[PDB]
Amino acid sequence: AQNPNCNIMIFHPTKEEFNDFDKYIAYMESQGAHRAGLAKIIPPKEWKARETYDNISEILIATPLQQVASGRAGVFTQYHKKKKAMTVGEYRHLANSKKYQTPPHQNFEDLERKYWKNRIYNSPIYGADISGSLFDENTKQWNLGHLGTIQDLLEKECGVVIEGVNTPYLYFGMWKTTFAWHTEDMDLYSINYLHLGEPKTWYVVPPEHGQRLERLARELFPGSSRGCGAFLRHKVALISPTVLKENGIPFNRITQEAGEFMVTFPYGYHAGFNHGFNCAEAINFATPRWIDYGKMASQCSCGEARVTFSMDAFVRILQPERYDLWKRGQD
Ligand SMILES: O=C(O)CNC(=O)C(=O)O
Ligand SMILES: [Mg+2]
Ligand code: NI
Ligand SMILES: [Zn+2]
């Protein structure tokens, strides 16, 4: 069995190997990469996403989100308070202001220590989930707006044609902006490219051990767990590496830098934080190996999770017994 300890693997594809996206995902899996829940892919030196980032300031962040924490430093939830619209140039200036800028630090480990000690005492503002892309149309390799669609994969594997679309999303971050513990919608893969700026630190639980994280979360967030049998789908709960280690939860960590891709694998729980002003692009995708995960994915039906249009068909076809309850939660 490849990668039996479920370590995060880092790949360096050649320019030739960077041509065929699906084939390379399957290669990484042949080496056991998926066992970790997360892999890093460093693009060949010949590749670029676009020519420059000098002209992005006029992008609008219609609904910046202030991420307000409640709890204790290592075990907390966050809620998202909506703020007035601002441009990426305005948001960049805000991120670099004295109130929001990254503190002085020695190295990534020192900054991680400071994040977990102090996160809850601040409310950073995140430009998340903005439909759009920063890949040049002429970038042919690993262009996240030109991937095969999940609807097409489902149709190829199972024969059923479905409605829906699959487009990328931009994320503008600042110091302490946080992504809560989650798997993807329908336990899909995700791919995330860090276009520019400061790093992103990731934590991940191997898919084979995801239920250990779920059981801890039910213990640590007992009101939330009574409210909803899949409350991690709400994407609000944080648990620190120290708390995970105290509770024996298997996990790994890695820091992504600008110019690097990360892939999350089906049912790989992940969480993390941004080091300073940055911009990432991410999208969900599927492979044949996903279908069994999609059929077994938990679902939130309490009303909180609310998701895209395109998840309807995935539930309807892969999980017909659950469909009527889930759709009520959507309505
Ligand atoms: O970068 C972020 O805030 C969160 N991204 C992801 O959870 C992802 O790419 O799957
Ligand atoms: Mg612009
Ligand atoms: Ni994710
Ligand atoms: Zn719920």
Swiss-Prot record:
Which stretch of the full-length chain is present here? Answer: 11 to 341 of 523
List residues of the JmjC domain. Answer: 136-302
| Recorded GO CC terms | blood microparticle; chromatin; nucleoplasm; nucleus; pericentric heterochromatin; site of double-strand break
What is the cofactor note?
Binds 1 Fe(2+) ion per subunit.
Q: Please state the gene responsible for encoding this protein.
A: KDM4D
Q: Which residues bind Fe cation?
A: 182, 184, 270
Domain JmjN stretches: 8-50
Mainly localized where? nucleus
The cysteines joined by S-S bonds are none
**Residues that coordinate or bind Zn(2+):** 228, 234, 300, 302
Q: Which UniProt keywords apply?
A: ADP-ribosylation, Chromatin regulator, Dioxygenase, Iron, Metal-binding, Nucleus, Oxidoreductase, Transcription, Transcription regulation, Ubl conjugation, Zinc
Protein name per Swiss-Prot or TrEMBL: Lysine-specific demethylase 4D
Origin species: Homo sapiens
Its EC number(s): 1.14.11.66
Post-translational modification here is noted as:
Ubiquitinated via 'Lys-63'-linked ubiquitin chains. Deubiquitinated by USP14 with the help of TRIM14 leading to stabilization.
Q: Which reaction does it catalyse?
A: N(6),N(6),N(6)-trimethyl-L-lysyl(9)-[histone H3] + 2 2-oxoglutarate + 2 O2 = N(6)-methyl-L-lysyl(9)-[histone H3] + 2 formaldehyde + 2 succinate + 2 CO2
> What does the UniProt entry say about where the protein is found?
Nucleus
Please give the Gene Ontology molecular function terms for this protein: chromatin DNA binding; damaged DNA binding; histone demethylase activity; histone H3K9 demethylase activity; histone H3K9me2/H3K9me3 demethylase activity; metal ion binding
